[PDB]
Design a protein around this ligand. Structure first.
Ligand SMILES: CCCCCCCC/C=C\CCCCCCCC(=O)O[C@H](COC(=O)CCCCCCCCCCCCCCC)COP(=O)([O-])OCC[N+](C)(C)C
Ligand SMILES: CCCCCCCC/C=C\CCCCCCCC(=O)O[C@H](COC(=O)CCCCCCCCCCCCCCC)COP(=O)([O-])OCC[N+](C)(C)C
Ligand SMILES: CCCCCCCC/C=C\CCCCCCCC(=O)O[C@H](COC(=O)CCCCCCCCCCCCCCC)COP(=O)([O-])OCC[N+](C)(C)C
Ligand SMILES: CCCCCCCC/C=C\CCCCCCCC(=O)O[C@H](COC(=O)CCCCCCCCCCCCCCC)COP(=O)([O-])OCC[N+](C)(C)C
Ligand SMILES: CCCCCCCC/C=C\CCCCCCCC(=O)O[C@H](COC(=O)CCCCCCCCCCCCCCC)COP(=O)(O)OC[C@H](O)CO
Ligand SMILES: CCCCCCCC/C=C\CCCCCCCC(=O)O[C@H](COC(=O)CCCCCCCCCCCCCCC)COP(=O)(O)OC[C@H](O)CO
Ligand SMILES: CCCCCCCC/C=C\CCCCCCCC(=O)O[C@H](COC(=O)CCCCCCCCCCCCCCC)COP(=O)(O)OCCN
Ligand SMILES: CCCCCCCC/C=C\CCCCCCCC(=O)O[C@H](COC(=O)CCCCCCCCCCCCCCC)COP(=O)(O)OCCN
Ligand SMILES: CCCCCCCC/C=C\CCCCCCCC(=O)O[C@H](COC(=O)CCCCCCCCCCCCCCC)COP(=O)(O)OCCN
Ligand SMILES: CCCCCCCC/C=C\CCCCCCCC(=O)O[C@H](COC(=O)CCCCCCCCCCCCCCC)COP(=O)(O)OCCN
Ligand SMILES: C=C(C)[C@]12C[C@@H](C)[C@@]34O[C@](Cc5ccccc5)(O[C@@H]1[C@@H]3C=C(COC(=O)Cc1ccc(O)c(OC)c1)C[C@]1(O)C(=O)C(C)=C[C@@H]41)O2
Ligand SMILES: C=C(C)[C@]12C[C@@H](C)[C@@]34O[C@](Cc5ccccc5)(O[C@@H]1[C@@H]3C=C(COC(=O)Cc1ccc(O)c(OC)c1)C[C@]1(O)C(=O)C(C)=C[C@@H]41)O2
Lengths: 604, 289, 39
């Protein structure tokens, strides 16, 4: 064994030739062929052919490494990786890499020779394997996870421009070849174990390039034209109207692309930019303009009424006695009690809606305050209302201490409804983001400074006065300096006036002049950085609003409000009458001058 | 060759190319001799000299250089452990980047007196940033957080003991059998011990580094502030045991400084470390004018 | 501590290395000198 391995590594067949007659007369698992293939330089491994001939003259071709790390690897995989067309053909003429190296430091390409060839830019080897006379590869085969070659191609994509160009081109080539070989089979419809298709997988994983390619792709070849999603309804001059498939973009049995993009947990790289693709933005705008805007405005109006009733009923709360408060025959009492009942009902409604959302989505802690700010705020207001009810019926007077907070939250939650308008939706987005990010840092630093100087000042004071020798009072008096209401001499119970005035001046210069102006500068810089990002965040928020409204209204009319019209785009390869729910859009282009064919309809 | 380099793009290309050529020829003629190991009178090697003088181009060339020629391959620092497809894992030498007998590159870059042109950008080279992040994640983060926690405890004890200072009489204040007096005296002892500790640490730093006056407030802001707080504490002690009531006039200042020194510990976090950096720089530059 | 090759006179060039991975689509595998046979 050692001598054979040494001869194979040395690329010398003299020792192997001498030992062959002797053999005839007489943890890893690597075979002689695998070792020869691995230890090959510039195709200098010549012992492979002799070893294969000897093995045939004496099952060895399929020998594979048995190690869990490299389980399943064979000579064909090594040849394919090495980019040896001749060696690959020779090995094929005369499996799945399940090893941990090839599972989801490692490289994932699927677990089939066809997938490995497809993911590596060896198109010729893909073609040869697909139409190899000795043995053709199975285009529809799936690995352990269930990914096909198309799933593997989607997984490989990393949004790099060259990588995107590759993955899209190879996807198109494999699609066309698969259609040519097996017209009946629908390759894209296949799903992996998780249940996602290549399009759904691309939308879920954030691969914007693959999604953009798939959504709007046209194959002009008459041989394979049904493998397209964007057609051309007609064209007269520089004007032409086209269609988009919208097959599983609007409503799909498993999961549509819109809801996969919108309901992503923000771990997806670029959810915000994934809705700018050609069909999706226009589809969302169509849904907004058609039937969602009126429902949104009605919801806003009803919330306004609820808040007005809540404010009126809380303003006129009974003040004399202890809760609960017995009813009175006066009409005012009846109206007040009606207001309280309506407020409590609204609180319960929001409580249940928040619980429903948190169960359905199961957000993680990190993304809880980054993707569900509005839901958290509404749920917290409902929680305050319910605590207020519990205290009120427990003969406690602290219920008001809860109620007011809820009431305050109520009004400040009206900003949620500013997402129906672009220019105010962006303003609310910036308010949210600044509150989340900047104020935490600013307040940590501010409180460090304030507490340090308040402790120093109250230590200096001796109260011997107005009992200013209190930490709370000194903290409040030093905080007043920040809001332009600070008295420089608010006490005289100190033995040393110079120390007191020096401390106050230092605090004023360090916080009022330095920290606050620095915060102004940082807010200005942040406004510039996120001028465009806020627009994308607002668009995502409105898209989620549209999806929620449509899902809620599905009960009233599940399929009545469907986007796009059913149209015939051509004939199927086997039958005819290729009917699909298309979404027409027009376009005008002076430069190119009408040079194309395939206009579905004769007359514009 | 290192001395000649002036960080110009053409100059850098020259100096690196000639360095490589001379290295290869020297290896061919005299394989046994290790040319780079030689040092000048000051004791620096070409790599250490490049790191010290701020020559970022020469440092970047030296740190990550591979000579594929089989004749002279050991004259390389960045290898290639393996490669399967578009994925490959490589290695870096780290010979005298982490620990060196004379002076490692990391400590030469970090402990430079800011006269070096571009200390700040010299840590972005391929091995150094990842090496520092590895050290942070592995064993330094926990010690930093423990130090922050202990400083928080010290500051809380100091604040509590200074808040309840005796007000009637003249120092020193005789002890009382009450438990509150025992706790207060324990707080004072702990505060004084912390002040002495920071005093000695500041003296140690200033002796080891010997900063110049110009760079004193540009490279050792935190050290100066901690030393000044310790100085205030010691002056407070001296006045307190001299039967003077002005010790409080010192103590409070120290106390104030104490809390505002917590910002030193915001460098364990990027987004607040940058904020503290800007506070420092603005205080130094803009407010004077 | 890892072995990176053989010294010009002796052998077993051992040094304290710091491994890092890299991924690159564009260039397509064209080099030699991989220290280890198997990834
Ligand atoms: C009665 C009609 C209720 C259905 C409408 C509806 O849910 O809109 C809702 C008002 O619902 C209320 O809060 C009112 C419930 C109490 C009724 C008293 C007010 C009467 C004037 C409108 O709000 P929404 O769009 O349900 O939620 C927006 C905020 N989240 C929860 C989506 C984040
Ligand atoms: C949509 C409609 C929204 C319009 C909203 C509010 C308009 C109400 C203003 C007119 C009231 C003033 C006269 C007055 O003193 O009466 C009060 C009774 O007034 C009420 O109880 C009004 C409660 C209305 C909320 C339920 C709506 C449900 C409909 C579905 C009795 O006054 P009082 O007991 O002296 O209390 C004094 C309280 N303070 C001054 C001490 C604070
Ligand atoms: C006792 C353990 C002391 C060692 C830890 C240490 O030096 O951390 C130190 C706290 O050290 C103290 O100030 C506390 C000393 C007095 C003990 C009373 C508090 C008990 C609660 C932490 O601080 P450091 O990292 O030494 O220095 C950070 C600032 N410079 C000096 C590096 C600029
Ligand atoms: C970690 C723990 C940190 C927790 C920190 C502080 C928590 C202490 C608050 C409880 C004290 C209030 C009751 C009271 O009047 O007692 C006081 C004694 O209280 C003390 O002496 C507390 C000193 C503690 C610091 C040493 C920690 C060492 C442990 C290792 C006596 O009150 P008094 O003499 O009237 O003085 C009045 C002073 N003013 C109001 C005039 C300013
Ligand atoms: C009450 C406070 C709300 C105040 C809204 C200010 C605003 O109305 O903002 C602009 C113009 O919008 C409109 O048509 C007005 C829509 C009217 C609906 C009113 C809400 C219904 C009942 C609520 C009570 C730009 O935004 P826009 O709606 O996208 O308009 C079209 C725009 O010019 C194209 O970009
Ligand atoms: C006390 C007040 C200190 C407040 C810290 C706020 C902050 O910590 O800010 C961000 C989050 O970081 C963290 O993990 C939190 C680390 C928790 C350690 C707490 C200190 C230990 C005991 C001290 C008392 C980003 O900074 P980061 O650490 O670099 O996190 C990773 C970051 O997202 C990657 O860039
Ligand atoms: C942005 C929001 C702007 C306006 C929202 C209006 C909804 C407020 C609900 C009414 C509150 C309420 O009942 O307050 C009553 C009316 O208060 C007012 O003064 C007028 C309120 C109108 C507010 C519009 C701005 C209580 O006052 P009173 O009964 O005259 O005297 C007390 C004895
Ligand atoms: C920052 C570091 C500055 C610390 C300087 C504190 C000044 C100490 C003054 C002091 O102790 O005594 C008290 C202050 O007397 C003075 O006038 C000090 C003069 C001001 C110093 C100016 C320093 C400018 C900074 C005495 O007042 P009294 O006993 O009530 O009569
Ligand atoms: C600084 C010199 C001020 C000075 O000598 O004026 C004396 C100032 O006396 C004081 O009250 C102390 C004021 C010193 C504070 C100036 C330092 C502020 C800078 C903080 C940063 C005369 O004042 P008077 O005897 O109360 O009448
Ligand atoms: C950023 C820093 C934030 C918090 C750091 C907390 C460490 C402060 C140390 C405690 C100071 C202390 O002993 O103050 C005592 C407590 O003062 C307070 O009111 C609560 C202090 C908690 C501060 C947290 C913010 C003296 O007050 P008392 O004994 O209730 O009445 C006097 C007779
Ligand atoms: C859950 C969180 C973060 C939060 C809950 C409450 C207590 C809140 O204080 C904060 C912390 C705070 C405290 C003081 C000033 C700023 C922030 O911020 C919000 C939270 C911050 C707001 C600011 O107003 C808004 O953000 C409205 C709003 C903006 C964007 C939205 O998409 C939105 O949809 C619901 C609502 C107002 C309060 O909710 C309010 O009215 C009360 C009494 C305190 C504010 O805690
Ligand atoms: C050595 C110097 C420059 C200094 C020492 C003290 C007296 C200081 O005033 C200054 C001058 C001054 C006075 C008033 C306003 C701004 C600046 O600035 C600092 C110095 C300025 C600060 C500002 O807070 C900080 O800078 C905290 C800090 C930031 C960055 C750090 O890396 C850091 O590490 C220790 C600490 C607070 C004081 O130290 C403080 O608490 C007291 C009572 C006065 C401030 O002199």
């Amino acid at each position: 064994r050692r001598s054979i391995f040494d001869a194979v590594a040395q690329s010398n067949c003299q020792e192997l030739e001498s030992l062959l007659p002797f053999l005839q007369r007489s943890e890893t698992g690597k075979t002689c062929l695998l070792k020869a293939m691995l230890n090959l330089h510039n195709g200098q491994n010549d012992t492979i052919a002799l070893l294969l001939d000897v093995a045939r003259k004496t099952q060895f071709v399929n020998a594979s490494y048995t190690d869990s790390y490299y389980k399943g690897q064979t000579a064909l995989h090594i040849a394919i990786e090495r980019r040896n067309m001749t060696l690959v053909t020779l090995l094929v003429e005369n499996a799945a890499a399940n090893g941990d190296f090839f599972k989801k430091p490692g490289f994932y390409f699927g677990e089939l020779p066809l997938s490995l060839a497809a993911c590596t830019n060896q198109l010729a080897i893909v073609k040869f394997l697909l139409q190899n006379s000795w043995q053709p590869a199975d285009i529809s085969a799936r690995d352990s996870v269930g990914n096909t070659v198309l799933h593997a191609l989607v997984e490989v994509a990393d949004n790099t421009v060259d990588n995107t160009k590759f993955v899209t081109s190879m996807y198109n080539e494999i699609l066309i070849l698969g259609a040519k070989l097996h017209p009946t089979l629908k390759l894209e419809e296949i799903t992996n174990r998780k249940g996602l298709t290549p399009l759904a997988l691309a939308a879920s994983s954030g691969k914007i390039g693959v999604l953009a390619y798939i959504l709007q792709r046209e194959i002009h070849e008459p041989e394979c034209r049904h493998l397209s999603r964007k057609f051309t309804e007609w064209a007269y001059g520089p004007v032409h109207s086209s269609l988009y498939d919208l097959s599983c973009i609007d409503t799909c049995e498993k999961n549509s692309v819109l809801e996969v993009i919108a309901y992503s947990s923000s771990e997806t790289p670029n959810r915000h930019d994934m809705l700018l693709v050609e069909p999706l933005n226009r589809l969302l705008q169509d849904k907004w303009d058609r039937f969602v805007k009126r429902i949104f405005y009605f919801n806003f109006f009803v919330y306004c009424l609820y808040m007005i009733i809540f404010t009126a009923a809380a303003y006129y709360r009974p003040v004399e006695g202890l809760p609960p408060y017995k009813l009175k025959n006066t009409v005012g009492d009846y109206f007040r009690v009606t207001g309280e009942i309506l407020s409590v009902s609204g609180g319960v409604y929001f409580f249940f809606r928040g619980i429903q959302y948190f169960l359905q989505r199961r957000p993680s802690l990190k993304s809880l305050f980054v993707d569900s700010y509005s839901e958290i705020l509404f749920f917290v207001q409902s929680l305050f209302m319910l605590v207020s009810v519990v205290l009120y019926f427990s003969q406690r007077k602290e219920y008001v201490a809860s109620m007011v907070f809820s009431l305050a939250m109520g009004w400040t939650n009206m900003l949620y409804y500013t997402r129906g308008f672009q220019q105010m939706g962006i303003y609310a987005v910036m308010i949210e983001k600044m509150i989340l990010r900047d104020l935490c840092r600013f307040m940590f630093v501010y409180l460090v400074f304030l507490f340090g100087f308040s402790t120093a000042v109250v230590t200096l004071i001796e109260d011997g006065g107005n009992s200013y020798n209190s930490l709370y009072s000194t903290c409040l008096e030093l905080f007043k300096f920040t809001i332009g209401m600070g008295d420089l001499e608010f006490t005289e119970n100190y033995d040393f006036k110079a120390v007191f005035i020096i401390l106050l001046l230092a605090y004023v210069i360090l916080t009022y002049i330095l920290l606050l102006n620095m915060l102004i500068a940082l807010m200005g810089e942040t406004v510039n950085k996120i001028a465009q990002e806020s627009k994308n965040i607002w668009k995502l928020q409105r898209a989620i609003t549209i999806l929620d409204t449509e899902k809620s209204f599905l009960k009233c009319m599940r399929k009545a409000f469907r986007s796009g019209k059913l149209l015939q785009v051509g004939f199927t390869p086997d039958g005819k009458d290729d009917y699909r729910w298309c979404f027409r859009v027009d376009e005008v282009n002076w430069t190119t001058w009408n040079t194309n064919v395939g206009i579905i309809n004769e007359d514009p």
